[PDB]
Write a protein that binds this ligand. Structure first.
Ligand SMILES: C[C@@H](N[C@@H](CCc1ccccc1)C(=O)N[C@@H](CCCNC(N)=[NH2+])C(=O)Nc1ccccc1)C(=O)O
Ligand SMILES: [Zn+2]
Ligand SMILES: [Zn+2]
Length: 173
């Protein structure tokens, strides 16, 4: 995890997101699921909340692109960069791009989209590669016998929480 020159942090908890386009491999709902999942993954370790917008300009407008797609980060075929994302902010910032020139799956068999989505989103949220191998923010793909149990490492939470931090358990004191 990391911050930025100005400290990454949205001024609102009620965030919005949107998938501009999908990949010629997965179904729509399936793709959106990856985000829906990535979001929840962080929702578990932040007070933040999310909402989808059938139309309009959402805060996190997730949009895929192959090869060149603006800026200076030209995709190229399958493999390599699976998905990249920038710190939070207007314009290029907040957004997240995947590789449309790559296969995708909804579980541990292909390049688990959600698994990748929870990484890119991390950049969007305001944290970068962490110092743990079990972490999904690590600069290397990481799977599990059962992703249905997957979780972010303390390394990841460290930042996501340090920048925010959800409330304690209700049934307490
Ligand atoms: C590209 C961006 N996103 C990562 C996701 C890594 C990840 C880890 C754990 C769970 C999900 C996702 C990514 O796609 N990394 C690439 C490496 C990009 C190197 N770029 C460069 N040198 N300019 C990656 O891991 N590719 C890859 C694909 C298949 C197998 C192994 C690695 C990043 O590197 O920060
Ligand atoms: Zn990009
Ligand atoms: Zn990364």
């Amino acid at each position: 995890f990391r911050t930025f020159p100005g400290i990454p942090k949205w001024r609102k908890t009620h965030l919005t997101y949107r998938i501009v386009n999908y990949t010629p491999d997965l179904p729509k709902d399936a793709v959106d699921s990856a985000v829906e999942k990535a979001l929840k993954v962080w929702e578990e370790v932040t007070p933040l909340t999310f909402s989808r917008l059938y139309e309009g300009e959402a805060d996190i407008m997730i949009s895929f692109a192959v090869r060149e797609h603006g800026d200076f980060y030209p995709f190229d075929g399958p493999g390599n960069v699976l998905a990249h994302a920038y710190a939070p902010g207007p314009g290029i910032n907040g957004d997240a791009h995947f590789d449309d020139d790559e296969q995708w799956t909804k579980d541990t068999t292909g390049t688990n989209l959600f698994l990748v989505a929870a990484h890119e989103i991390g950049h969007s949220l305001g944290l970068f590669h962490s110092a743990n191998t079990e972490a999904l923010m690590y600069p290397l793909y990481h799977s599990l016998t059962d992703l249905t149990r997957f979780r972010l490492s303390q390394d990841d939470i460290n930042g996501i929480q340090s920048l925010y931090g959800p409330p304690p358990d209700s049934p307490e004191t």
